Amino acid sequence: EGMNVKKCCKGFCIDILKKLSRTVKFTYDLYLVTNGKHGKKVNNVWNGMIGEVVYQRAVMAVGSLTINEERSEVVDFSVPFVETGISVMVSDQVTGLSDKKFQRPHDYSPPFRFGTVPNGSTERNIRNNYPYMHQYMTRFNQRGVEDALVSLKTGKLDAFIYDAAVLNYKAGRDEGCKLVTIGSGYIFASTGYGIALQKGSPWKRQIDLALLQFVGDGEMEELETLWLTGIC
Amino acid sequence: IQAVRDNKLHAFIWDSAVLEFEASQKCDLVTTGELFFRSGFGIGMRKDSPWKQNVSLSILKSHENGFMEDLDKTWVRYQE
Amino acid sequence: FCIDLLIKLARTMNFTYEVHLVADGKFGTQERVNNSNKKEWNGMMGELLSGQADMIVAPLTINNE
């Protein structure tokens, strides 16, 4: 039995879909179904919202995830409204990902819990870039985002590699400003958040025009001040 | 740039990377830290070009790997 | 970096790029031009519409206009 309760939520994607329905003036059928996580071409296993938007007949999805290879070859994402990329946020002397402590973890930086969320875009990007780093993150895979935040607030987690936007959102509510983002997310991956659209859909042009009008009218600073509330 | 570097005008509004490179090269020019209009500037393409998606996919594949970032760090990031 | 990007694109694909400098030094505005009242861009973007340019490698600011 599946409880189809009509619960209301607020957030970033909620405001995005609200302004989309207010400007483009279209009707949508939003539903939050319990699914898996970000899917990729690993043994052709497609789960979560990514696996749903991979197939056709799906109009769109408010979830704007990081740009990848398969998620760009299967469907055509819209224009990236954000420029935040994949970076590392160690919970000082390191220089990001170009430090020599990652290529040779035997002498310096002994192998610790450096894994990301299971079945994530960062895992695929690292496997495409660094096989040994991907194997290390796999053998040291951590728990979900909430457990990662708990470990960061505790001090046992050494570094947390994710998108710069997620790191800024986490740092905006730190309990004393302990963890600091060592290096912004523009020298490692430089990705963005694109709306999951349908391959060859007539609404793609409308969504692109709506995004270019929303980030081309002078309210980008207002959005940055409203959403990003980083005080430290 | 020649005007603002020789004490002729007040300030200059331009791209963030260009002003950062000018500040790293020219010590007299020190740009502010407040950054706004954070948007990825795309490459202008034709309206009915047949390879409109091919060049975009190529740029995406080149940016996914660690080549474009290294080239940018070695060329644009001239720190003295 | 532009030449390196062009070389990488020509290595991945099989197209022949043509490197040329624009005669003017501005991008152009979408105001009413003095050429038969054509409300379009007067510059490299206008040359792209006519047929002179084919791929503007300059990172132009994306917008609805």
Curated annotation (Swiss-Prot), chain A:
Underlying gene: Grin2a
Residues that, per the record, bind L-glutamate: S64, T66, R71, S121, T122, D163
Similarity comment text for this entry: Belongs to the glutamate-gated ion channel (TC 1.A.10.1) family. NR2A/GRIN2A subfamily.
Name recorded for this polypeptide: Glutamate receptor ionotropic, NMDA 2A
Domain of life: Eukaryota
The organism of origin for this protein: Rattus norvegicus
Annotated consequence of substituting V166A: Decreased sensitivity to glutamate
Expression by tissue: Detected in brain cortex, olfactory bulb, hippocampus including the dentate gyrus, striatum, thalamus, superior colliculus, inferior colliculus, midbrain and cerebellum (at protein level). Detected in brain cortex, hypothalamus and cerebellum.
Coiled coil spans: none
Sugar-modified residues: N119
Cysteines paired by S-S bonds: C177-C232
Comment block on domains: Contains an N-terminal domain, a ligand-binding domain and a transmembrane domain. Agonist binding to the extracellular ligand-binding domains triggers channel gating. A hydrophobic region that gives rise to the prediction of a transmembrane span does not cross the membrane, but is part of a discontinuously helical region that dips into the membrane and is probably part of the pore and of the selectivity filter.
Biological role stated in the UniProt entry: Component of N-methyl-D-aspartate (NMDA) receptors (NMDARs) that function as heterotetrameric, ligand-gated cation channels with high calcium permeability and voltage-dependent block by Mg(2+). NMDARs participate in synaptic plasticity for learning and memory formation by contributing to the slow phase of excitatory postsynaptic current, long-term synaptic potentiation, and learning.
Extracellular side: 92-232
Compartments it resides in: Cell projection, Dendritic spine; Cell membrane; Synapse; Postsynaptic cell membrane
Oligomeric form and interacting partners: Heterotetramer. Forms heterotetrameric channels composed of two GluN1/zeta subunits (GRIN1), and two identical GluN2/epsilon subunits (GRIN2A, GRIN2B, GRIN2C or GRIN2D) or GluN3 subunits (GRIN3A or GRIN3B) (in vitro). Can also form heterotetrameric channels that contain at least two GluN1 subunits and at least two different GluN2 subunits (or a combination of one GluN2 and one GluN3 subunits) (in vitro). In vivo, the subunit composition may depend on the expression levels of the different subunits. Found in a complex with GRIN1, GRIN3A and PPP2CB. Found in a complex with GRIN1 and GRIN3B.
UniProtKB/Swiss-Prot annotation, chain B:
UniProt: glycine binding residues: D15
Gene behind this protein: Grin1
Assembly mode: Heterotetramer; the NMDAR subunits are modular and harbor tiered domains that function in concert to regulate opening and closing of the cation-selective ion channel pore. Forms heterotetrameric channels composed of two GluN1/zeta subunits (GRIN1), and two identical GluN2/epsilon subunits (GRIN2A, GRIN2B, GRIN2C or GRIN2D) or GluN3 subunits (GRIN3A or GRIN3B) (in vitro). Can also form heterotetrameric channels that contain at least two GluN1 subunits and at least two different GluN2 subunits (or a combination of one GluN2 and one GluN3 subunits) (in vitro).
UniProt tissue specificity: Detected throughout the brain, in brain cortex, cerebellum, thalamus and olfactory bulb.
Post-translational modification: NMDA is probably regulated by C-terminal phosphorylation of an isoform of NR1 by PKC. Its phosphorylated state is influenced by the formation of the NMDAR-PPP2CB complex and the NMDAR channel activity.
Subcellular location: Cell membrane; Postsynaptic cell membrane; Synaptic cell membrane; Postsynaptic density membrane
Lineage: Eukaryota, Metazoa, Chordata, Craniata, Vertebrata
Function: Component of N-methyl-D-aspartate (NMDA) receptors (NMDARs) that function as heterotetrameric, ligand-gated cation channels with high calcium permeability and voltage-dependent block by Mg(2+). NMDARs participate in synaptic plasticity for learning and memory formation by contributing to the long-term potentiation (LTP). Channel activation requires binding of the neurotransmitter L-glutamate to the GluN2 subunit, glycine or D-serine binding to the GluN1 subunit, plus membrane depolarization to eliminate channel inhibition by Mg(2+).
Protein name: Glutamate receptor ionotropic, NMDA 1
Family named by the database record: Belongs to the glutamate-gated ion channel (TC 1.A.10.1) family. NR1/GRIN1 subfamily.
Full-protein residues shown: 718 to 797 of 938
Domain note: A hydrophobic region that gives rise to the prediction of a transmembrane span does not cross the membrane, but is part of a discontinuously helical region that dips into the membrane and is probably part of the pore and of the selectivity filter.
Residue positions with a glycan: N54
The organism of origin for this protein: Rattus norvegicus (Rat)
Domain of life of the source: Eukaryota
